[PDB]
Amino acid sequence: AFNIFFMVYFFIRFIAASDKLWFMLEMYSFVDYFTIPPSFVSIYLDRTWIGLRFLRALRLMTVPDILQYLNVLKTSSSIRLAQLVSIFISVWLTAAGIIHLLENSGDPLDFDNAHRLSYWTCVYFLIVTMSTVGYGDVYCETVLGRTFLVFFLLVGLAIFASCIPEIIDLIGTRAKYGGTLKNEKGRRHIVVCGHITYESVSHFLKDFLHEDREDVDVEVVFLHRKPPDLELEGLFKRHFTTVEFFQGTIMNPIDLQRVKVHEADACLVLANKYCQDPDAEDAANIMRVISIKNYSDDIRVIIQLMQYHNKAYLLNIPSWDWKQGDDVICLAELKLG
Amino acid sequence: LKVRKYWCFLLSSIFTFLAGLLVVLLWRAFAFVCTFMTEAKDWAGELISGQTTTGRILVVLVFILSIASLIIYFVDASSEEVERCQKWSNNITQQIDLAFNIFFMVYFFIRFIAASDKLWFMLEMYSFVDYFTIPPSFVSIYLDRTWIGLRFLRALRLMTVPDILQYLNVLKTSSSIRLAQLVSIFISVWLTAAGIIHLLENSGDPLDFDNAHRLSYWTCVYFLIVTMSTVGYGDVYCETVLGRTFLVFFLLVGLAIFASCIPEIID
Numbered sequence: 001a002f003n004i005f006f007m008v009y010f011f012i013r014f015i016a017a018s019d020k021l022w023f024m025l026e027m028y029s030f031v032d033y034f035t036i037p038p039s040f041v042s043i044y045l046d047r048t049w050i051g052l053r054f055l056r057a058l059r060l061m062t063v064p065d066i067l068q069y070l071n072v073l074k075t076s077s078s079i080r081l082a083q084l085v086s087i088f089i090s091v092w093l094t095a096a097g098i099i100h101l102l103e104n105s106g107d108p109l110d111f112d113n114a115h116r117l118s119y120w121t122c123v124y125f126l127i128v129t130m131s132t133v134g135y136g137d138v139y140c141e142t143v144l145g146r147t148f149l150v151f152f153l154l155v156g157l158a159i160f161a162s163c164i165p166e167i168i169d170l171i172g173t174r175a176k177y178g179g180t181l182k183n184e185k186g187r188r189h190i191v192v193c194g195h196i197t198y199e200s201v202s203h204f205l206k207d208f209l210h211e212d213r214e215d216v217d218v219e220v221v222f223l224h225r226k227p228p229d230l231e232l233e234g235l236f237k238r239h240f241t242t243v244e245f246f247q248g249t250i251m252n253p254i255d256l257q258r259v260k261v262h263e264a265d266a267c268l269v270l271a272n273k274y275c276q277d278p279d280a281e282d283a284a285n286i287m288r289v290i291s292i293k294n295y296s297d298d299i300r301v302i303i304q305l306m307q308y309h310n311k312a313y314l315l316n317i318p319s320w321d322w323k324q325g326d327d328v329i330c331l332a333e334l335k336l337g
Numbered sequence: 338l339k340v341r342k343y344w345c346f347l348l349s350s351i352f353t354f355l356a357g358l359l360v361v362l363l364w365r366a367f368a369f370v371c372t373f374m375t376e377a378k379d380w381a382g383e384l385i386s387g388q389t390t391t392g393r394i395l396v397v398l399v400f401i402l403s404i405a406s407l408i409i410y411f412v413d414a415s416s417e418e419v420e421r422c423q424k425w426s427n428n429i430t431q432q433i434d435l436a437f438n439i440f441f442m443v444y445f446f447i448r449f450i451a452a453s454d455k456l457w458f459m460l461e462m463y464s465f466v467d468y469f470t471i472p473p474s475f476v477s478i479y480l481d482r483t484w485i486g487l488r489f490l491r492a493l494r495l496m497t498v499p500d501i502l503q504y505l506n507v508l509k510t511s512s513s514i515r516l517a518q519l520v521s522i523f524i525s526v527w528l529t530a531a532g533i534i535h536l537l538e539n540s541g542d543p544l545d546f547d548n549a550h551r552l553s554y555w556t557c558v559y560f561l562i563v564t565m566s567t568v569g570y571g572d573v574y575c576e577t578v579l580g581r582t583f584l585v586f587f588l589l590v591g592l593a594i595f596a597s598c599i600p601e602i603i604d
């Protein structure tokens with residue numbers, strides 16, 4: 001019942017083929033040549049043979065094509081991952097079928113040195129070979145089995161060494177920093193963005209959380225684009241109950257929702273004082289204030305500014321209001337003062 | 338050993354995980370249809386991170402019994418048999434195991450309170466270790482018989498050593514933190530995988546248990562390092578169906594760990 005469907009599917013593919021000569025030599029059609037015709041012969045002969053039924057595993061390499069036809073796979077990484085997994089599994093299962101047939105049948109024209117091996121033992125034997133472990137508990141004994149193993153060792157080992165490392169890093173690790181900040185009743189928090197480094201965060205947290213000042217239950221939420229390094233991650237661990245970090249940009253309205261800017265007491269924009277171009281640094285920080293004010297107008301913003309002539313741009317923003325608590329800390333004005 | 342009660346140990350661990358999973362979901366529904374918790378949640382989170390003086394003691398105390406729990410598992414796996422019945426009062430090893438396990442459940446409860454969301458906490462990797470470790474101890478207490486079970490999961494607790502050292506500010510530079518993470522990950526995976534091989538090979542195939550392969554735990558440790566190095570002497574190899582099945586999955590991922598951790602540890 002399955003084979004008759006595949007021949008009419010083969011005929012449909014034949015009609016759709018642009019050139020018939022190259023279609024007959026296609027890899028997929030070669031699978032159908034050695035699969036369906038044996039079924040009819042076994043029907044007339046009233047006897048069954050395992051034959052080359054292992055070639056059905058080669059049909060798994062068209063799964064990424066099938067998923068792309070239905071638009072299930074969209075991003076490039078998912079397409080690459082699907083191709084590598086499908087190729088590795090199909091080759092692994094097909095090679096195990098070849099070993100299973102050659103070993104169990106025995107040498108041709110005598111068929112007296114048959115080696116009894118289960119198919120799943122051959123699957124286990126194949127993965128030991130591709131990993132280059134080679135226990136030797138299971139090994140090929142027939143001439144044909146060893147002959148195929150010689151060719152497989154040349155090409156099969158390269159597939160394992162190229163697919164598995166690329167599969168692992170493509171999967172990667174789950175995003176450690178992400179998701180929305182959990183809402184709490186009667187909770188006060190501030191959002192700190194801009195120049196977020198280990199030196200800037202540690203210096204800020206020491207001054208912000210000092211037992212010489214009044215005790216207030218305000219927690220700090222950090223938003224930055226680049227993931228933190230190991231030193232910064234350890235610092236956040238030591239302040240687990242009062243400091244939270246999220247990965248994202250203040251210019252993305254989605255990320256502003258994640259950190260709950262509209263519910264924050266104030267937004268603090270740190271600046272890179274040791275920057276090559278003070279004008280470029282000031283322009284980036286000014287755009288951050290515009291993004292925050294665009295999301296909501298009644299949010300207190302405190303921003304570190306590098307040069308005084310850039311202060312006019314912030315003052316000309318319609319939503320900027322010094323009465324409501326918006327402040328500009330100009331390093332050039334304060335230092336020279 | 339006429340009838341094996343290993344299913345009772347597995348059923349209780351599955352039931353405990355399922356009961357806790359639905360209770361959290363039911364409590365969310367119960368809360369939906371219907372100040373101390375907030376105060377306790379902040380206090381609990383401060384304790385597990387070792388911010389206060391009592392928090393530092395608990396974090397250090399967690400380190401001490403994490404190694405101790407694994408050590409008593411080594412002497413427990415040295416037994417020739419995997420299943421045996423004995424009075425709990427006769428052996429002092431079971432008594433010490435109970436003393437360590439009761440601490441880990443109250444430590445689990447403290448971590449549960451400190452958790453921001455309870456649903457994701459129940460699915461955490463660390464909590465999965467506690468699901469299959471402590472509930473079997475109580476079942477073995479009532480059944481008056483002991484089983485090796487999944488006690489090898491205690492080695493997974495070693496991956497929190499870098500977190501413990503970071504809580505106490507022992508690790509400061511980035512290189513030391515990276516080195517601690519790689520060493521802890523490699524050792525925990527190596528010891529856990531050896532425990533899986535030791536259990537599967539010694540127990541035998543399920544529902545028959547007649548093809549058991551007698552292997553010591555340290556032989557499995559030696560077998561694992563030969564596998565990850567891709568040397569494969571073949572003097573020691575898996576014979577059971579379940580043992581080979583796990584080896585197939587380990588060869589896909591375990592070999593990558595060795596090839597990525599050891600070169601990075603050396604330099």
Ligand SMILES: CC(C)CCC[C@@H](C)[C@H]1CC[C@H]2[C@@H]3CC=C4C[C@@H](O)CC[C@]4(C)[C@H]3CC[C@]12C
Nearest residue numbers: 030034051052101102105106107108109111144
């Ligand atoms: C594309 C064509 C020309 C390639 C050559 C045809 C191939 C596929 C055919 C022709 C001869 C056939 C082989 C003849 C003899 C044997 C030995 C038997 O115990 C297993 C099958 C096996 C190994 C056959 C496999 C398929 C085979 C190799």
Ligand SMILES: CC(C)CCC[C@@H](C)[C@H]1CC[C@H]2[C@@H]3CC=C4C[C@@H](O)CC[C@]4(C)[C@H]3CC[C@]12C
Nearest residue numbers: 343347351486487536537540541542543544579
């Ligand atoms: C997270 C949950 C859903 C995963 C599935 C539950 C797992 C952990 C449980 C359910 C069935 C259990 C298995 C049932 C049978 C056996 C065979 C026995 O000789 C060794 C233990 C072993 C191998 C058990 C290991 C643990 C097990 C696999």
Ligand SMILES: [K+]
Nearest residue numbers: 132133567568
């Ligand atoms: K090798």
Ligand SMILES: [K+]
Nearest residue numbers: 133134568569
């Ligand atoms: K070898």
Ligand SMILES: [K+]
Nearest residue numbers: 132133567568
């Ligand atoms: K080898």
Ligand SMILES: [K+]
Nearest residue numbers: 135136570571
């Ligand atoms: K060998």
